[PDB]
Design a protein around this motif. Structure first.
Motif, mmCIF file in Angstrom:
data_model
loop_
_atom_site.group_PDB
_atom_site.id
_atom_site.type_symbol
_atom_site.label_atom_id
_atom_site.label_comp_id
_atom_site.label_asym_id
_atom_site.label_seq_id
_atom_site.Cartn_x
_atom_site.Cartn_y
_atom_site.Cartn_z
ATOM 1 N N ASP A 67 0.849 -1.197 0.000
ATOM 2 C CA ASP A 67 0.000 0.000 0.000
ATOM 3 C C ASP A 67 0.882 1.244 0.000
ATOM 4 O O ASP A 67 0.986 1.945 1.011
ATOM 5 N N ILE A 68 1.504 1.520 -1.143
ATOM 6 C CA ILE A 68 2.385 2.668 -1.267
ATOM 7 C C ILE A 68 1.644 3.991 -1.127
ATOM 8 O O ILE A 68 2.241 4.996 -0.730
ATOM 9 N N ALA A 69 0.348 3.996 -1.442
ATOM 10 C CA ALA A 69 -0.444 5.211 -1.288
ATOM 11 C C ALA A 69 -0.562 5.487 0.202
ATOM 12 O O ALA A 69 -0.382 6.621 0.646
ATOM 13 N N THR A 70 -0.864 4.440 0.968
ATOM 14 C CA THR A 70 -1.002 4.550 2.417
ATOM 15 C C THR A 70 0.314 4.996 3.049
ATOM 16 O O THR A 70 0.341 5.939 3.842
ATOM 17 N N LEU A 71 1.407 4.316 2.701
ATOM 18 C CA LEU A 71 2.725 4.653 3.247
ATOM 19 C C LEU A 71 3.253 6.018 2.827
ATOM 20 O O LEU A 71 4.094 6.595 3.517
ATOM 21 N N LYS A 72 2.766 6.539 1.706
ATOM 22 C CA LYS A 72 3.212 7.856 1.255
ATOM 23 C C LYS A 72 2.916 8.903 2.341
ATOM 24 O O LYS A 72 3.727 9.802 2.580
ATOM 25 N N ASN A 73 1.754 8.792 2.987
ATOM 26 C CA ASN A 73 1.347 9.736 4.035
ATOM 27 C C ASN A 73 2.244 9.718 5.277
ATOM 28 O O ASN A 73 2.312 10.702 6.027
ATOM 29 N N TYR A 74 2.935 8.605 5.492
ATOM 30 C CA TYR A 74 3.805 8.462 6.657
ATOM 31 C C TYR A 74 5.256 8.873 6.457
ATOM 32 O O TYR A 74 6.041 8.855 7.409
ATOM 33 N N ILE A 75 5.624 9.230 5.236
ATOM 34 C CA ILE A 75 6.998 9.652 5.007
ATOM 35 C C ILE A 75 7.069 11.130 4.678
ATOM 36 O O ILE A 75 6.126 11.707 4.137
#
Lengths: 65, 88, 100, 271, 65, 116
Positions: free
Chosen positions: A16-24
RNA sequence: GCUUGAGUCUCGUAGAGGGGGGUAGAAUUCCAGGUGUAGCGGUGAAAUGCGUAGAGAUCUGGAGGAAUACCGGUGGCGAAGGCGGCCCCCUGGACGAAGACUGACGCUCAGGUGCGAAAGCGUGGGGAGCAAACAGGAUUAGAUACCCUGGUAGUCCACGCCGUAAACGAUGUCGACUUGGAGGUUGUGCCCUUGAGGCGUGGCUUCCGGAGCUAACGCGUUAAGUCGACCGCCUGGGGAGUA
RNA sequence: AGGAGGUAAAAAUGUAUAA
């Protein structure tokens, strides 16, 4: 209680790169649990998730390469 | 680790009943399978001191049970060790 | 009989030659009763950082179930092959479906 | 095994002997055995050309197959034998079509393994294949020089050649000493690493272990008389000349490498 | 890191770098391995954080201010 | 000569001086200037005013190349880090974007211990 | 004989717990080549050193070694020492749920055995950076120091040896009891998970405090309180943990 | 309110008798 994944309980996937994008951060650093207020279990879960996605070039290590 | 399949086999061989998984007979037999299983692990590494402690701890437990078992069921005792091959 | 989640890159050129690649891998696994579960070819996806050259790459996702003997040998076929880049192999956790 | 021999007598005090219990006892394979008369360091003229060689127990040269000119035919390693001619260990190898030839024994080799030579051979310690099907960055021994010559690099006990890179027609590798030599890509090689790595710790002990092997005593410069060697003489231990060889050449510091026809190949020199 | 703010920017407008690392790591990694002083100073740092929480709970006094 | 249009001004600002280097779009250098090179070595060398002047000394000596747009890429925890780019705004150039490429080692070699 | 002590099994959960083998990127240094020109590097100020043989700056490519930013938190794990990229293989301990089973199998432990940071030592590899020794330049009454440019053994790996540290919560281990509060972490049960909850029930752990105790400081249900079992240890300082 | 950057050359000694 500014969580996300704590309600939508699931074994966090690196895919879920979309999801993880928000955390970086824009630079590529891992935003701390102090800011997102994420539960500590899901934080370490997230850490391994990110590094595996980092390994597969789904997430940048930094801005300049 | 002692995989589950092998575990039920050992119990169903020494336990007086199919569910009798707490008898001293069983516990000694149980740990012995495990210790023999760890010899392969401690034949390669030979430096892994932490699980070395794991093995050492479970040996003393086996030791204490036979101490106990001897003093209580002398007859049963000699039967057990000849079926498991130990002491020397 | 573990469950693995093999993920590996492919250099673009051989991307043209990718179906036969997977066909060989799934055959060896099935050859040893390994039940395959997913086969999501991500396709030619752009990278984040360049892998020694190549600003472009091609991914293949597996999510296969197999015995430990087979998976160790099958991993070595990624090592000695100059098409597969970065091979990831993870553990079970109750093999999944639909994953993306 | 590296065993310290127990000090029974003054002379066996420091014999750290390398015992390898796997070594085949008995007589080696007869058909691959031809004589080797020593020459003690004497050429056709009969004069001593290279000093220090003489005496020593009677050796028997064994035909070790280096070329490895068999393609696609499996081999089952029979056993490991001893061989005085070199430091390594040779292995009696039997092919599927009933033929026995020797080969250097790689370190990951046990009696009864499976190896084969050829272009189609799989990557496994003991296999022999050309330097075009080897992954850039592995550990190789018995490297050739010209296509089909035989093998002349890293064939000593515990020696291995790193293949650093591969620039198309040439394979830039690196010898054990430190030089990075650039050889022809089509040259055959053998994966793995030559066994018997304990040879390093084999300390002779008494003079015999040196003497019965072939090394004669070396006589020092400051002991000889001035008519025999550029050093020595003096009323009592007086050096003072610049350290030279017995033929007036500056030793202990002079580059002597001169071929020029091979500099095209030497990428980086030993440092 | 990076900044363009396309057309009308006209000024530096980049203090967000202070918000990433920019000096916090450089002035930290410029020297001093320590190997265990951060253990000392982090225990000292979080000790001071609780000093604030102690003082926050200890603010409920008159003083006539 | 050569007539180039783009230009990447690498600015290495450390704790002692601000060596400034205007390169081309690819990496080839096209002239440079330093704090000390301007003529004032010492305590003054490590000042924001030094980086100011440094830009002027490099504002010229690139006139043969007539550069128009810039990609400033500052580098280093220097005191001149921030003042140098404003010196380039007034110099008559157009900064397209600003980038920071400070070497941030991921626990690389052990750093020295030169201070007490 | 019995089961509340202790232990085994069934299903799960978290973890830098240990060993072995692979792998990725960032950064320092070095080598090869391009561009390019007088300083660079350094300090409180300087100089040694590097640099018109063309450095430093910058870019392309390659070689290597060691460490793994951010996550990271008085956060977790191990008996202690300690242990942190990622991946796999082998493996230990803990904790919980609801049951089943053995039936005192328990606690401590002189001598004994095993583990035990960093430094050091032997043999064989490796050596980027850092850096005892040492050299040089400063500062200085002098500087064999702090500061600065260099730099070896060592720091690293494999296999053996050393057995000491402020090896420290300066608190030996084990069991029972005696009001509370704020947290963190990891389980689990119940109700409407209707909605990030509400109410409980366990382990680990941080902090603040009552009675009590202590010479005081402080400790305070993970006690230095009240009691029990056992072991180690002390009897003024210096001499000396030395002969 | 909550976090980051920057700030400090040299300067030794005082014997032996008072509640």
């Amino acid at each position: 209680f500014c969580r996300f994944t704590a309600e939508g309980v699931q074994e966090i996937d690196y895919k879920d790169i979309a999801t993880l994008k928000n955390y970086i951060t824009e630079s590529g650093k891992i935003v701390p649990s102090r800011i997102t207020g994420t539960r500590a279990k899901y934080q370490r879960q997230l850490a391994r998730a990110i590094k595996r996605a980092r390994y597969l070039s789904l997430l940048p290590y930094t801005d300049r390469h | 680790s002692l995989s589950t399949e092998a575990t039920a086999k050992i119990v169903s061989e020494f336990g007086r009943d199919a569910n009798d998984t707490g008898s001293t007979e069983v516990q000694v037999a149980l740990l012995t399978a495990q210790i023999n299983h760890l010899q392969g692990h401690f034949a390669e590494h030979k430096k892994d001191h932490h699980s070395r402690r794991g093995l050492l701890r479970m040996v003393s437990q086996r030791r204490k049970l036979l101490d106990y078992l001897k003093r209580k069921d002398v007859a049963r005792y000699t039967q057990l060790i000849e079926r498991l091959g130990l002491r020397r | 009989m573990r469950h693995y989640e093999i993920v590996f890159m492919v250099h673009p050129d051989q991307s043209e030659q990718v179906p036969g690649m997977i066909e060989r891998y799934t055959a060896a696994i099935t050859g040893a009763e390994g039940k395959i579960h997913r086969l999501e070819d991500w396709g030619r996806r752009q990278l984040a950082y360049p892998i020694n050259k190549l600003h472009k790459a091609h991914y293949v996702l597996m999510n296969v179930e197999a015995p430990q003997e087979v998976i160790d040998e099958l991993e070595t076929t990624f090592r000695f092959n100059d098409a597969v880049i970065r091979s990831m192999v993870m553990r079970t956790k109750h093999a999944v479906t639909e994953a993306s | 095994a590296v065993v310290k021999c127990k000090p029974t007598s003054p002379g066996r005090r420091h014999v750290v002997k390398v015992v390898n219990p796997e070594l085949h006892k008995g007589k080696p394979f007869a058909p691959l055995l031809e004589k080797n008369s020593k020459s003690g360091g004497r050429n056709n003229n009969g004069r001593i050309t290279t000093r220090h060689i003489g005496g020593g127990h009677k050796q028997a040269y064994r035909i070790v197959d280096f070329k490895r000119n068999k393609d696609g035919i499996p081999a089952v390693v029979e056993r490991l034998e001893y061989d005085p001619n070199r430091s390594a260990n040779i292995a009696l190898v039997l092919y599927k079509d009933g033929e026995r030839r020797y080969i250097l024994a790689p370190k990951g080799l046990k009696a009864g393994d499976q190896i084969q030579s050829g272009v189609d051979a799989a990557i496994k310690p003991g296999n022999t294949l050309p330097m075009r099907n080897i992954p850039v960055g592995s550990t190789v021994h018995n490297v050739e020089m010209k296509p089909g010559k035989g093998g002349q690099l890293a064939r000593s006990a515990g020696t291995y050649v790193q293949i650093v890179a591969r620039d198309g027609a040439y394979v830039t590798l690196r010898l054990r000493s430190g030089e990075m030599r650039k050889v022809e890509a089509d040259c055959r090689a053998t994966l793995g690493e030559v066994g018997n790595a304990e040879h390093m710790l084999r300390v002779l002990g008494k003079a015999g272990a040196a003497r019965w092997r072939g090394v004669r005593p070396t006589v020092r410069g400051t002991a000889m008389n001035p008519v025999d060697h550029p050093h020595g003489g003096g009323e009592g231990r007086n050096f003072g000349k610049h350290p030279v060889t017995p033929w007036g050449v500056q030793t202990k510091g002079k580059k002597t490498r001169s071929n020029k026809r091979t500099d095209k190949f030497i990428v980086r020199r030993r440092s | 890191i990076k900044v363009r703010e396309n057309e009308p920017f006209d000024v530096a407008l980049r203090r967000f770098k202070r918000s990433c690392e920019k000096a916090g790591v450089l002035a930290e990694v410029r020297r001093r391995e320590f190997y265990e002083k951060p253990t000392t100073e982090r225990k000292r740092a979080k000790a001071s954080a609780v000093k604030r929480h102690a003082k926050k709970l200890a603010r409920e006094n008159a003083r006539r201010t | 000569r050569k007539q180039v249009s783009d230009g990447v001004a690498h600015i290495h600002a450390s704790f002692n001086n601000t060596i400034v280097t205007i390169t081309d779009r690819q990496g080839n250098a096209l002239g440079w200037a330093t704090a000390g090179g301007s003529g004032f070595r010492g305590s003054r060398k490590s000042t924001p005013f030094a980086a100011q002047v440094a830009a002027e000394r490099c504002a010229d000596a690139v006139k043969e190349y007539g550069i128009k747009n810039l990609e400033v890429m500052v580098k280093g925890p220097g005191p001149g880090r921030e003042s140098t780019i404003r010196a380039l705004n007034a110099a008559g150039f157009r900064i397209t974007n600003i980038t920071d490429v400070t070497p941030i080692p991921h626990n690389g070699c052990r750093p020295p211990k030169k201070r007490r």
